[PDB]
């Protein structure tokens, strides 16, 4: 697909048959999802942006289906206003910026 | 050019004769640079991120060259962790996301 930047680059992802809308975010090193219950061991982590830091839980080797593409990696869960797909998963689906 | 996301997408930009490192951020609506002076009148605005709600200075119609592609639009200046090129300037240089 070719996604233009006139609008926020929102696409549908699927995590364990829970389907949500998330932002394709080249400005994010990590993927951060608003509250969901993921299984497995989760470790506390702090991540910052504009405004400061939020506490999130880091879940490792979590399958994420982004637009037909099978993604598997680290997913952070916390009080993020919008769901974010970061560079960790973006690189796995073969995503680039082209101009 | 084509930019992969294994590393953060930092590029050199020229703004007011000055060269800076900035990050191509498709998860940012707007372009925010770290503290600096620029030519103008400016309106104060508030914008929010993962952390919350900062105060920035808004400059309108400012020329910025990104990897030599010419843009002219809004540029906010404030307490951003890194220089960020948002979607308002990314669209002008015809930047897209592909996979």
């Amino acid at each position: 697909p070719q996604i233009t930047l006139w609008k926020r680059p929102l696409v549908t992802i699927r995590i364990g048959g829970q389907l949500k809308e998330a932002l394709l975010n080249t400005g994010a090193d990590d993927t951060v999802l608003e509250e969901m219950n993921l299984p497995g061991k989760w470790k506390p982590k702090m991540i910052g942006g504009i405004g400061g830091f939020i506490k999130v839980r880091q879940y490792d080797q979590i399958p994420v289906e982004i637009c037909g593409h099978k993604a598997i990696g680290t997913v952070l869960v916390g009080p993020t206003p919008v769901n974010i797909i970061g560079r960790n998963l973006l690189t796995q689906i073969g995503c680039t910026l082209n101009f | 050019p084509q930019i992969t996301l294994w590393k953060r997408p930092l590029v050199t930009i020229r703004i007011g004769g000055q060269l800076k490192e900035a990050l191509l951020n498709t998860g940012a609506d707007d372009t925010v640079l770290e503290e600096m002076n620029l030519p103008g009148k400016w309106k104060p605005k508030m914008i929010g991120g993962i952390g919350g709600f900062i105060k920035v200075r808004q400059y309108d119609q400012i020329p910025v060259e990104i990897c030599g592609h010419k843009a002219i639009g809004t540029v906010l200046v404030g307490p951003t962790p890194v220089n960020i090129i948002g979607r308002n300037l990314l669209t002008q240089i015809g930047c897209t996301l592909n996979f």
Binding site: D30, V32, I47, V82 | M46, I47, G48, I50
Partner: peptide
């Protein structure tokens, strides 16, 4: 991690 997301 700095997931520099922004709206406004």
């Amino acid at each position: 991690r700095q997931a520099n997301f922004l709206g406004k």
